[PDB]
Amino acid sequence: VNSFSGYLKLTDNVYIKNADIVEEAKKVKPTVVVNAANVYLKHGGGVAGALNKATNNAMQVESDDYIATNGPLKVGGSCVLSGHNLAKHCLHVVGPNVNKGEDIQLLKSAYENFNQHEVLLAPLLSAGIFGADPIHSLRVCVDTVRTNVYLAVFDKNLYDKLVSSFL
Ligand SMILES: Cc1c(C)n(Cc2ccco2)c2ncnc(N)c12
């Protein structure tokens, strides 16, 4: 038993809810919250800017130190950093950005990062400002992630479409 409430069960391990990933993290304080990161960990808008804003920019300060030491992530890659006031840990995962020409095949590699963590609160990778088809992102999630993932979908309209079209 865990602290996640109000989720619709899609599979043995995948759950979904119409929720802002920021308000959900503040309420639950999960072990792992996933950020929809870019390779530079520049948390300008979308999930990364809302998560970063909720940390009062501490996520960006930590991220800049990480990049100054390690250089950029890979598209499809991740790093674990602090969750600040939102979670124990933040898993920064880089899904491909369709609006930059990145190979959508890298979405599966992105979701494979989630398997290193028993339980996660996450957004749909490449949804929102990343520009991918969210229906596709949910299918890759279900077919790739084997650990327990709690998906927060910001848009109520999209949430209802994801549920009603789910095979
Ligand atoms: C700010 C934000 C974005 C852009 N997204 C991704 C998305 C999916 C559909 C509409 O936007 C989010 N997803 C979960 N929580 C959030 N706060 C967000």
Side-chain angles (χ1 to χ4, degrees), residues 1-26 28-166:
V1 179
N2 65 48
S3 155
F4 292 105
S5 182
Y7 285 71
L8 170 77
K9 179 173 184 55
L10 291 175
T11 72
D12 179 58
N13 67 296
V14 179
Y15 295 77
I16 194 163
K17 181 183 181 176
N18 172 220
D20 183 318
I21 202 172
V22 187
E23 288 317 311
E24 193 70 11
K26 280 196 283 190
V28 176
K29 286 287 243 87
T31 304
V32 181
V33 65
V34 173
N35 181 31
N38 59 53
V39 294
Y40 307 106
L41 302 179
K42 283 173 53 91
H43 310 304
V47 163
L51 291 171
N52 175 62
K53 178 178 176 189
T55 76
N56 180 45
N57 211 53
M59 179 181 282
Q60 192 62 68
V61 170
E62 178 196 31
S63 293
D64 292 343
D65 170 89
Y66 174 87
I67 297 287
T69 299
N70 301 106
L73 298 178
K74 301 171 179 176
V75 179
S78 67
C79 68
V80 179
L81 291 174
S82 178
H84 300 278
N85 55 315
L86 305 177
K88 187 168 198 288
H89 304 288
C90 180
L91 181 71
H92 295 273
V93 180
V94 185
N97 193 323
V98 174
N99 306 313
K100 306 177 178 175
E102 297 170 352
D103 170 19
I104 192 62
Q105 300 305 137
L106 288 170
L107 187 53
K108 188 170 182 78
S109 301
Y111 275 115
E112 286 170 342
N113 298 287
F114 286 27
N115 290 322
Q116 300 293 319
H117 305 277
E118 287 194 351
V119 183
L120 315 88
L121 170 63
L124 282 166
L125 303 170
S126 303
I129 72 181
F130 284 63
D133 170 9
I135 295 176
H136 175 66
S137 183
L138 182 54
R139 180 34 61 191
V140 179
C141 179
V142 156
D143 293 346
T144 304
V145 179
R146 299 177 301 282
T147 55
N148 296 322
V149 57
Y150 289 83
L151 294 169
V153 177
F154 180 88
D155 192 83
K156 168 61 166 158
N157 185 291
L158 173 57
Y159 169 84
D160 285 349
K161 181 173 135 109
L162 286 167
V163 169
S164 70
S165 60
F166 184 71

